[PDB]
Design a protein around this motif. Structure first.
Motif, PDB file in Angstrom:
ATOM      1  N   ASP A  62       0.895  -1.155   0.000  1.00 14.70           N
ATOM      2  CA  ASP A  62       0.000   0.000   0.000  1.00 14.70           C
ATOM      3  C   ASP A  62       0.933   1.205   0.000  1.00 14.70           C
ATOM      4  OD1 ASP A  62      -1.611   2.186   0.585  1.00 14.70           O
ATOM      5  OD2 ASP A  62      -2.501   1.309   2.382  1.00 14.70           O
ATOM      6  N   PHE A  63       1.055   1.863  -1.150  1.00 15.72           N
ATOM      7  CA  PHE A  63       2.070   2.889  -1.347  1.00 15.72           C
ATOM      8  C   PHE A  63       1.634   4.270  -0.880  1.00 15.72           C
ATOM      9  CE2 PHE A  63       3.114  -0.483  -4.410  1.00 15.72           C
ATOM     10  CZ  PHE A  63       4.334  -0.849  -3.868  1.00 15.72           C
ATOM     11  N   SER A  64       0.530   4.361  -0.136  1.00 13.24           N
ATOM     12  CA  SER A  64       0.252   5.577   0.614  1.00 13.24           C
ATOM     13  C   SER A  64       1.182   5.715   1.810  1.00 13.24           C
ATOM     14  CB  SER A  64      -1.207   5.597   1.076  1.00 13.24           C
ATOM     15  OG  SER A  64      -1.441   4.606   2.059  1.00 13.24           O
ATOM     16  N   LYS A  65       1.790   4.616   2.248  1.00 17.60           N
ATOM     17  CA  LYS A  65       2.814   4.624   3.281  1.00 17.60           C
ATOM     18  C   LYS A  65       4.178   4.662   2.607  1.00 17.60           C
ATOM     19  CE  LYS A  65      -0.327   1.314   4.938  1.00 17.60           C
ATOM     20  NZ  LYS A  65      -0.648   0.004   5.570  1.00 17.60           N
ATOM     21  N   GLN A  66       5.071   5.488   3.135  1.00 19.56           N
ATOM     22  CA  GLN A  66       6.367   5.689   2.510  1.00 19.56           C
ATOM     23  C   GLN A  66       7.407   4.741   3.098  1.00 19.56           C
ATOM     24  OE1 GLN A  66       8.215   9.056   1.058  1.00 19.56           O
ATOM     25  NE2 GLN A  66       6.436  10.426   1.127  1.00 19.56           N
ATOM     26  N   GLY A  67       8.446   4.482   2.309  1.00 20.60           N
ATOM     27  CA  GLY A  67       9.529   3.632   2.734  1.00 20.60           C
ATOM     28  C   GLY A  67       9.132   2.172   2.774  1.00 20.60           C
ATOM     29  N   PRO A  68       9.935   1.355   3.457  1.00 19.91           N
ATOM     30  CA  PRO A  68       9.657  -0.091   3.493  1.00 19.91           C
ATOM     31  C   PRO A  68       8.308  -0.447   4.093  1.00 19.91           C
ATOM     32  CG  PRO A  68      11.910   0.350   4.166  1.00 19.91           C
ATOM     33  CD  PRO A  68      11.228   1.685   4.079  1.00 19.91           C
ATOM     34  N   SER A  69       7.732   0.410   4.939  1.00 23.05           N
ATOM     35  CA  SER A  69       6.425   0.110   5.515  1.00 23.05           C
ATOM     36  C   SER A  69       5.320   0.059   4.470  1.00 23.05           C
ATOM     37  CB  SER A  69       6.077   1.114   6.616  1.00 23.05           C
ATOM     38  OG  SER A  69       6.871   0.894   7.770  1.00 23.05           O
ATOM     39  N   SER A  70       5.618   0.405   3.215  1.00 20.60           N
ATOM     40  CA  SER A  70       4.620   0.285   2.161  1.00 20.60           C
ATOM     41  C   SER A  70       4.208  -1.164   1.929  1.00 20.60           C
ATOM     42  CB  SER A  70       5.157   0.898   0.869  1.00 20.60           C
ATOM     43  OG  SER A  70       6.394   0.308   0.508  1.00 20.60           O
ATOM     44  N   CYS A  71       5.082  -2.121   2.236  1.00 17.03           N
ATOM     45  CA  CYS A  71       4.789  -3.527   1.989  1.00 17.03           C
ATOM     46  C   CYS A  71       4.958  -4.337   3.264  1.00 17.03           C
ATOM     47  CB  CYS A  71       5.674  -4.120   0.883  1.00 17.03           C
ATOM     48  SG  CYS A  71       5.519  -3.279  -0.710  1.00 17.03           S
ATOM     49  N   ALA A  72       4.093  -5.344   3.420  1.00 16.25           N
ATOM     50  CA  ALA A  72       4.138  -6.196   4.604  1.00 16.25           C
ATOM     51  C   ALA A  72       5.401  -7.048   4.635  1.00 16.25           C
ATOM     52  CB  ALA A  72       2.891  -7.076   4.659  1.00 16.25           C
ATOM     53  N   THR A  73       5.869  -7.505   3.473  1.00 18.36           N
ATOM     54  CA  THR A  73       7.117  -8.250   3.373  1.00 18.36           C
ATOM     55  C   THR A  73       7.952  -7.680   2.235  1.00 18.36           C
ATOM     56  OG1 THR A  73       6.284  -9.990   1.868  1.00 18.36           O
ATOM     57  CG2 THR A  73       6.016 -10.371   4.240  1.00 18.36           C
ATOM     58  N   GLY A  74       9.253  -7.541   2.479  1.00 16.93           N
ATOM     59  CA  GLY A  74      10.179  -7.132   1.440  1.00 16.93           C
ATOM     60  C   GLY A  74      10.137  -5.671   1.051  1.00 16.93           C
ATOM     61  N   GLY A  75       9.553  -4.810   1.883  1.00 16.88           N
ATOM     62  CA  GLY A  75       9.475  -3.401   1.549  1.00 16.88           C
ATOM     63  C   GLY A  75      10.845  -2.765   1.406  1.00 16.88           C
ATOM     64  N   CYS A  76      10.891  -1.678   0.634  1.00 15.84           N
ATOM     65  CA  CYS A  76      12.153  -1.030   0.316  1.00 15.84           C
ATOM     66  C   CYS A  76      12.002   0.482   0.343  1.00 15.84           C
ATOM     67  CB  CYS A  76      12.652  -1.442  -1.071  1.00 15.84           C
ATOM     68  SG  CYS A  76      11.551  -0.953  -2.421  1.00 15.84           S
ATOM     69  N   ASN A  77      13.106   1.159   0.649  1.00 14.94           N
ATOM     70  CA  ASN A  77      13.168   2.599   0.449  1.00 14.94           C
ATOM     71  C   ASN A  77      12.886   2.905  -1.014  1.00 14.94           C
ATOM     72  OD1 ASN A  77      14.015   3.381   3.129  1.00 14.94           O
ATOM     73  ND2 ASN A  77      16.058   2.600   2.632  1.00 14.94           N
ATOM     74  N   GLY A  78      12.075   3.933  -1.248  1.00 15.38           N
ATOM     75  CA  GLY A  78      11.616   4.291  -2.571  1.00 15.38           C
ATOM     76  C   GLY A  78      10.166   3.954  -2.831  1.00 15.38           C
ATOM     77  N   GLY A  79       9.597   3.015  -2.081  1.00 18.89           N
ATOM     78  CA  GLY A  79       8.214   2.629  -2.276  1.00 18.89           C
ATOM     79  C   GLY A  79       8.032   1.626  -3.395  1.00 18.89           C
TER      80      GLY A  79
END
Length: 235
Positions: A62-79
Motif C-alpha cells: 500500500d504505497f500511501s505509506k512511505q519507505g519499506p512500511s509500504s509492503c508487509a514483506t520485502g518493503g524497500c526505500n523508494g516505495g
C-alpha cells in the motif's frame, strides 16, 4: 544482453523488485526496480552481461505509506520502485540472486532464504543448466510465533530466519546470524543455527544461513549464455 522473465504464478498480486549489487560492473536499466504483478502475469526485460543483483517479491503493498512500511514483506526505500542505493528489501524476502559472467566465465545464481522466506520461487533457464527452487510453502509451518509475519487477518505471509526474528535476543553475538563471537565459518556451524533444519528440509536448494553459499554455490552455475526466468509460486 540476456532476457530475464519475472513471472507471478501466485493467485494474488505481488510486487516484484530488483536491486543491483554496489560492485556490479553493469546496471539494469531496461526495467524500473519495482512493479505491480497481477496474479498470473509476467514482465520480461533485457539485462546486461556482468550484472549482479537480486530479485524478490513483495506482499501486501500500500504505497500511501512511505519507505519499506509500504509492503508487509520485502518493503524497500523508494516505495513502488526500490531506490538504487538504499532499496534492498526488508526481511522476510525470498531472493533470486544472480552474478552474471563471474569467475571462470560462469553465471552464478541461487534462491536464498537466509534472512527468512516469503514466497516459493523457481529460477529456470533455457540452456539445461541447474535450476534451484523452493517450491513448497514455508509459511503455514513457520515454527515459532516471533518468526511469523502476519497479515491483518492473522495469516502467516512470511517466516523470518531465527536470526532476523531475534530469537536469541542478541543480534550482535549470535550463532544464528553468525556475528560477534560467531562471525566466521569455524565459529558458526550450520548445526548451531536455530531452525536451519526447518528451512533446509522444506527447500534443500535454498540458502538458509550465512555460509550455505560458500558451500553450495558450485551447484548453481551456467556458462551457456542463458536467459533466466524467476517464477513466484511455481508449479
Amino acid at each position: 544482453m540476456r532476457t530475464f522473465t519475472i513471472r507471478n504464478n501466485c493467485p494474488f498480486t505481488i510486487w516484484p523488485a530488483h536491486f543491483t549489487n554496489p560492485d556490479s560492473p553493469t546496471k539494469l536499466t531496461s526495467q524500473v526496480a519495482g512493479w505491480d504483478a497481477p496474479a498470473r502475469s509476467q514482465k520480461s526485460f533485457q539485462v546486461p552481461d556482468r550484472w549482479a543483483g537480486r530479485f524478490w517479491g513483495r506482499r501486501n503493498c500500500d504505497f500511501s505509506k512511505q519507505g519499506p512500511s509500504s509492503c508487509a514483506t520485502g518493503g524497500c526505500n523508494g516505495g513502488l520502485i526500490c531506490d538504487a542505493r538504499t532499496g534492498s528489501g526488508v526481511p522476510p524476502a525470498t531472493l533470486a540472486e544472480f552474478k552474471l559472467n563471474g569467475d571462470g566465465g560462469k553465471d552464478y545464481y541461487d534462491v536464498s532464504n537466509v534472512d527468512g522466506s516469503n514466497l516459493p520461487v523457481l529460477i529456470s533457464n533455457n540452456k539445461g543448466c541447474p535450476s534451484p527452487s523452493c517450491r513448497v510453502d514455508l509459511n503455514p509451518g513457520c515454527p515459532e510465533d516471533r518468526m511469523k509475519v502476519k497479515d491483518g487477518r492473522g495469516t502467516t505471509i512470511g517466516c523470518l530466519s531465527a536470526c532476523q526474528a531475534n530469537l536469541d535476543g542478541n543480534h550482535g553475538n549470535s550463532a544464528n546470524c553468525c556475528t560477534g563471537s560467531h562471525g566466521k565459518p569455524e565459529t558458526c556451524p550450520k548445526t548451531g543455527v536455530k531452525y536451519y533444519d526447518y528451512f533446509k528440509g522444506k527447500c534443500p536448494d535454498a540458502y538458509a544461513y550465512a555460509y550455505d553459499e560458500s558451500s553450495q554455490s558450485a551447484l548453481w552455475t551456467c556458462n551457456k549464455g542463458a536467459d533466466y526466468t524467476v517464477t513466484f509460486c511455481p508449479h
